[PDB]
Design a protein around this ligand. Structure first.
Ligand SMILES: Nc1ncnc2c1ncn2[C@@H]1O[C@H](COP(=O)(O)OP(=O)(O)OP(O)(O)=S)[C@@H](O)[C@H]1O
Ligand SMILES: Nc1ncnc2c1ncn2[C@@H]1O[C@H](COP(=O)(O)OP(=O)(O)OP(O)(O)=S)[C@@H](O)[C@H]1O
Ligand SMILES: Nc1ncnc2c1ncn2[C@@H]1O[C@H](COP(=O)(O)OP(=O)(O)OP(O)(O)=S)[C@@H](O)[C@H]1O
Ligand SMILES: [Mg+2]
Ligand SMILES: [Mg+2]
Ligand SMILES: [Mg+2]
Lengths: 323, 323, 323, 323, 323, 323
């Protein structure tokens, strides 16, 4: 089969690998060193000859590249273009000065050029390093994840038992707060017989205890809602929504209204009460919600969401909303 | 007549059977074995050389196909395309990566390709086996369908008598909860003289006790609402709506408002109170509902729906809402 | 004049009669026998070689046509097409599988073909036999039409006197409940000097006691609202709206708001309270109602509608709402 | 000047009078006799060889024309077309079966043809005779116009004094109730120095006591609102709105909100409370009202309208709302 | 500079002065005499050979022009056309029968032709004479402008002091009530150092005590809102809005919400409470107000507007709302 | 790298500097002298040969240019066009009479021409001088910035501590009130380790204590929201929004709802309570807010905004809203 599968992939691979190699060398050439760094969460470039790296410990570390070819207005632009074309987009100094794309391996990239940056020699790049490690839940308890909670044992058991029964759980907090990481470890408590479907933007979730599953990715023409909609047609036992965005927003409510099993998703929210408002908002953006009272959605999400876990900027649970 | 009916069908049959045969062999070739399995509810493929089958008893069973030609990226793609073309759709790795269609006999098929699947060697297929059996109502009582209810006799008699008088009844619950099945058996209690019209997506309902009837199917160009709208022009005594979707949603409310006889339909809802909300939601999606207060619909459905029956994941009634 | 009127009609008649004859023979050929049957209300065909006829007494009678040429897939399709073209529409197995048209004499026809019907040999036809008889009001009293009412004399006199004074009256109930028939007999109590205008879909109303009048028909490009709008420009004393549909819905409210005389109309509603909701709904569908509070319409119709009469499935008044 | 005015009008006159003459002879030819009848309010034809005329005393009088050439399907059609073309419209038996236009002198005409009329030999015409006489107010008092009122003197003086001060007054009631007439007589009490602007559909208002004035007519391209909008740019002391229609509806509210002087208009409403609702409705039809609470308009009109006078079907004031 | 400025203006001037001269002679030719008349406010023509002039004292004076060439259907039309073309518009007897334009000097003109006027010999013209005089505030006190007020000294001082501090003041009343005139005199109390920007339709405001200022005019493609929007970009100390219209309506609210200094504007409103409603209305017409509660605007304007002055038809303050 | 960076910029620089030089000389030629003046805030020209300059101390100073070539209708127009073309816009006396652009260095320019200005010799220019200086916070305390406050120490410490913790703070007041300035000094209290992203319209913010940062500019094709949206993808610790405009308005609410760190922005509002209303308004302009109750936004912003500081026209804090 592989002999035929290869000849069958040949055409697409050639095409893809004819746009992914130029980008691979450029990436390698510029941010290669930094990408090798362990425990980092972001790599930024403020077109000022210095590369700023954000570490898991929340510390920004600057690096000097004054004397490097890979950081020439031209060498930079070539990498920029490599990013646009990869995701089939264009990047220039007129109509498309701002850009959003990805690297060869999947990391999100944010590129900005003049006239949007302060001058014509400033090229702003911002790469987001996904969750590339899986620590067991126990690891989280050890590091004292539920230490700020007064319902410490109640929480540690709620999460374990709850998820095992298929409650709808939301993990929220700020950027890089460790939400994705957290949901990844608590997956240990989902019966290994459950068919799981995940909707991601970047492959981040890993299935260490589940043979039957399937991953879905949105981006470009295909939308987050498209994945979730397809998801509900693929007979899932558990649906792991990388992170509620805005498209899924409303369709997520309906999925909850049909009394759907184990839902687990991360979201940008500063707390439980906030998450609830956060959801109503995003839902109301969808036309289908047009005729539904706003304060009617919040109550709606408040009946459906079983438990919420919020994580502060110090990667620690500081709120464990239940029921 | 058959001699002319044949020559008259000849042209359409040729055309149809020139797109249905390629699909039949592919189907047969790949999921032939699995489709033959008794008491299954879904057949999934996660493009990882293993076929997962979900049994009626809720158990997932993996089957190895590492050494089968029918599971070659090419052999799989040919079957995929056969599905697209059958329902007159296209499936590719650019604009049409996700697909929804059917098999030669009517079973729903969900196909997903790269870039939506994790890689270019993953082809996700999800086949849903319809309700292909009819157990008498008595069979449900024997298996203790109304055993979790405290109003056990009241329930078993309500359903029987109610339906016989033409009350509006909704059967709700999760996917594969046995709703389609349940309504099919309780049809025994509808006077055999009643002209029945059903709106389905896949032939599933069977008329074992009714000579005068007619089945309607939506899909593609023709919408669920279209069928129901035509239905109301075909002089029905009972209308069996396969399952409230969203188009019919509002038009179903109006049909209830005109005080229509015996309505029976399945719906995705986790309970009685949920079904009510579920309906208001779907109704409000229809423009015609634009000027109608949301909390006005729920009350609306709550006056019209005579009785609701919810089935848990263990195929058992756990709620018997009435009046 | 007739000599010239004939030469003047010649062109249109030729055209019309060149599409109405093909349809006449086909009709005659297939459902000719059944159409001759007295006291029937519907003739259905479930493309299964059996013709089902619904009688006034609410009984379904099957007839075998296994051995009849008029019921050959081809012979059927020819009649089908004859129906489309007549009303200037198309009927096929692709974009136009469902059809709604009429017969040579005016009866509504509902035709459905594959892929909407279960298979390619099933052709569903449903003809609605209009009200083709006029029983005097006295006949209704004799058959005990107001017998279920406790305000028996009050009702029999209300209807008589009310209509004589030009109150707005609505006759509602299910399909074939005898509404049109009822309004037709109670017309006896409208001063013979009143100019009456009727808006129908199929000629059904007959003027036995009124010389000055005019009938209006909607269908195709011309809408129900168009007739009513023209109606209000033809100086009517009484307006008989065959049956409130949805277009007239709102324009009917305004007509009531201008304090218009004797309005009489039939409607699909299961009761008085229902009719009121039924109206608000239909009105809110019209854009012009966009800025009007829904609960504001119901109250609106409740101030305007003088009396409502509902008829159960046994062709008997079971509710006589007044004031 | 007349010598040049003639040569200057020559071109337009020729054109107009080349479409108005054909119509004049047809008119003359058919309804010539009837149009000559004194005290009539409508002339209808139900394409059944009989001409029905409605007299001021509310009596319908039938006239036989069985033996007249002017009533030949052709002779009738020629007159019909003459009406269409006059107002630059088309009338046929397909897309333009219904028609609304006018006669050589301005009377509204409603023409209906098959398929909208019952058959192809029925041509329905409905002519409305405008208010072609002016009876002094005193004449109304003599005929006992304010006789049903208990506030008889208060009413007769309110109208006189009120109007003299420029209050906003509405005259409402049914069709032909004598509203147009009533307002025309009460104009006697408007200081002769007032510049008056009227917005009509058909010249009906006459200025017997006012030298400074100007009449405006809407129809076709030009809308009722257009006239009123131009009106407010022509420095009016009094604005006589023939009859609130729907366009002016909202723009009338704003005109009242700017505290405008003497407004006088007729409206189709069955009473004071009704007129108020009637107004809110029509206002809410205008987009500009989109963001304005419905129950906010009624209160709005209720602050602005100074006094309303309703006339029953017997041409008598039966309600004299004030303040 | 003038030598070059002339050669620089040459092109535009030629063009403008090649359309303004034809209009100058026509104007001069027809309404030349009347325009010379002192203390007039409007000049109307009802195409009946008589010219009606409205004097400041509120008296209408007719003038006979039966024997004047300037009033020939042709001589009139030439002037009419001169008006259209000037403001780059068209005026005819078909699609553009109504017209709005201006004269060589800026006065608003309203022209109406058949079929909108009663006949083909009636040409209605209405010229509005702007405020062409500036009376000192003292002049207003002398003529007893604040004489009907009980808070006579409080009012005379409020206006003086208030405006000096930059409160938001609205002057409202009917047409020609003397609002523009009033605001023009009270400008005396604005510190001469304030940079003032005015948004007018016709130059009317005069700056007698302010060197630093700038006038803005809307008309044609440029809208009232455009001026105000530009205004807020020209660093104004005081903004004099000729008169709130409808475009500025909402943008005026926001300007008040940002806590902007000295706003002074005239408006058509019959009183303080009315002005407040008047504003909410106009604001709600703007899309940007779409999601803002109507009763939320009124309160909004009621917090922002510092003081309102209303003037009756006798050019006298009759309401001095404050705080 | 510089050798290649130059050859790489060469093409864009040539182009830009081929449109920026003409503008530089014109600028220099006309407002060169004024631009050199210290402590000014605006430079206006009212096309009347006098240049008005507004000084920091709020004083308007007139300068005579009667005898200068740079102020010739032509010389002025050339500079005007230079402005249009620079920002790729057009400026003429027909469709583009009003203009908004910038100067060679970034200062906003407002140009107005006839017919919008009073005549064809009036060319109105309004130049706004950005914040080109940075006074330490201490400097503000010395000049008694918090002197009008009663919570003087509480305020001076709130700002210092609050900002250090990353509270959301809004600085509001009138134009040129010193907001841009104020926020710039209080930046001293943001841990130097924070990555800061600013969204400006004109480079004004200066980073004196922050190495890791990036500036964003909107204008033309690129919108304020675009920058903020990109901002949220560039991993910011603090987001300095030049000044809430209207696009960001709603997207700012959501950013607050996700519980985002340190937000600091200036806004046009006359006070705390006003700012709150100001925000709800701007938010409701965005479609995404369509389904969100207005009074729901104000409460929303009132939960999220930590502290507001308002500055009167005398550049002094007069309100210090907290919590
Ligand atoms: N308990 C932990 N101990 C150490 N590092 C951790 C911990 N939890 C998460 N991380 C680190 O945090 C990063 C992953 O953060 P995520 O969980 O993806 O952040 P995030 O908050 O989900 O960001 P977005 O905006 O949602 S994509 C990786 O670098 C991890 O190694
Ligand atoms: N009192 C009666 N006795 C006997 N037959 C009746 C009576 N009233 C009505 N019918 C029969 O009922 C049929 C007419 O029913 P309709 O009055 O048109 O029904 P309908 O309810 O108005 O249907 P739609 O859906 O409104 S078109 C005819 O066959 C009649 O002969
Ligand atoms: N106190 C006054 N005494 C004498 N004439 C006055 C006085 N105030 C105003 N006028 C006259 O009124 C006219 C100006 O009226 P405006 O103040 O422009 O009217 P207006 O009400 O503002 O009209 P619009 O509809 O707003 S354009 C001029 O003819 C003035 O001479
Ligand atoms: Mg994450
Ligand atoms: Mg009927
Ligand atoms: Mg004015």
């Amino acid at each position: 089969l592989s002999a035929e599968d290869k000849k069958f992939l040949e055409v697409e691979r050639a095409l893809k690998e004819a746009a992914l190699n130029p980008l691979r060398h450029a990436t390698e050439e510029l941010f290669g060193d930094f990408l090798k760094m362990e425990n980092i969460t972001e790599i930024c470039y403020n077109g000022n000859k210095v590369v700023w790296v954000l570490k898991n410990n929340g510390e920004w570390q600057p690096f000097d590249v004054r004397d490097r070819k890979a950081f020439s207005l031209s060498r930079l632009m070539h990498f920029a273009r490599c990013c646009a074309s990869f995701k089939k987009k264009t990047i220039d100094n007129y109509e498309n000065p701002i850009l959003s794309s990805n690297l060869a391996n999947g990391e999100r990239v944010q590129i900005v050029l003049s006239p949007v940056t302060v001058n014509d020699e400033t090229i702003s790049i911002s790469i987001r390093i996904p969750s590339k490690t899986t620590y067991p839940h126990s690891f989280f308890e050890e590091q004292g994840f539920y230490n700020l909670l007064d319902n410490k044992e109640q929480a540690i058991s709620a999460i374990k038992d709850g998820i095992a029964i298929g409650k709808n759980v939301i993990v929220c907090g700020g950027t890089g707060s460790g939400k994705t990481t957290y949901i990844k470890s608590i997956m240990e408590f989902i019966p290994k017989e459950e068919r799981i479907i995940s909707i991601e933007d970047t492959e981040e979730i890993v299935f260490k205890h589940h043979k039957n599953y399937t991953q879905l990715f949105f981006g470009g023409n295909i939308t987050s809602a498209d994945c979730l909609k397809s998801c509900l047609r693929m007979r899932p036992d558990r649906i792991i929504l990388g992170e509620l965005r805005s498209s899924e927003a409303y369709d997520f409510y309906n999925v909850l209204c049909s009394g759907h099993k184990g839902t687990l998703t991360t979201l940008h929210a500063g707390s439980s009460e906030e998450a609830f408002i956060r959801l109503a908002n995003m839902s109301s953006s969808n036309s289908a919600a047009r005729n539904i009272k706003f304060e009617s959605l919040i109550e709606g999400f408040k009946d459906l969401i079983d438990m919420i876990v919020h994580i502060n900027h110090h990667k620690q649970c500081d709120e464990f909303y239940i029921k």
